[PDB]
């Protein structure tokens, strides 16, 4: 959310006057004249706990687990039960670690 | 007032010329969406404020 969604004058009416104690926009004339402004209830108000761009987006994995996972992923590409059970139709294919010559 | 300065009635002439409907050839134009003049001012309800 871009900034405050509070770029709006609003104070409560507070007292009696038989309406709920949410802040109301000021002035008159326009439709937006006594409507309930900011708060996570209101049309035109501000959302609950607006997202910040400094949420932790990126994660660390230490290097000997990244290498563990990539030794575990090549070794499963060499078992025909595992590589067919992912979807790849390798039924007509020859010897399962398919290597070809360096001319390709 | 009938006593007015020249800036006032070259202001009141500009507000008097744009108090005018749309022409009826203009809703026939391709792709538009204006259908009546919504900026029309009546001399009793809405007042200019000098």
């Amino acid at each position: 959310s871009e900034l405050a969604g509070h770029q709006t004058s609003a104070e409560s009416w507070g007292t009696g006057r038989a309406v709920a104690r949410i802040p109301r926009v000021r002035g008159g004339g326009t439709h937006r004249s006594g409507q309930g402004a900011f708060g996570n209830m209101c049309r035109g108000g501000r959302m609950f706990a607006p997202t910040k761009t400094w949420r932790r987006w990126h994660r660390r994995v230490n290097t000997t687990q990244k290498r563990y996972a990539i030794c575990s992923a090549l070794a499963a590409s060499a078992l025909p039960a595992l590589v067919m059970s992912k979807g790849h139709r390798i039924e007509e294919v020859p010897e399962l670690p398919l290597v070809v010559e360096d001319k390709v | 007032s009938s006593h007015k300065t020249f800036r006032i009635k070259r202001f009141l002439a500009k507000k008097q010329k744009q108090n005018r409907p749309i022409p009826q050839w203009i809703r026939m134009k391709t792709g538009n969406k204006i259908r009546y003049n919504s900026k029309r001012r009546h001399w009793r309800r809405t007042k200019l404020g000098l």
Binding site: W13, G16, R17, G28, G29, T30, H31, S33, G34 | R35, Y36, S38, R40, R45
Partner: peptide, 26 residues
């Protein structure tokens, strides 16, 4: 013609105060 025009915002302002006053027993 046909297509008319918009009216005006209600712009209500509060007024009266618990009717005609009144103070409880002291």
């Amino acid at each position: 013609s046909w297509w008319p025009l918009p009216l005006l915002l209600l712009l209500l302002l509060l007024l009266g105060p618990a009717g005609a006053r009144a103070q409880e027993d002291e």
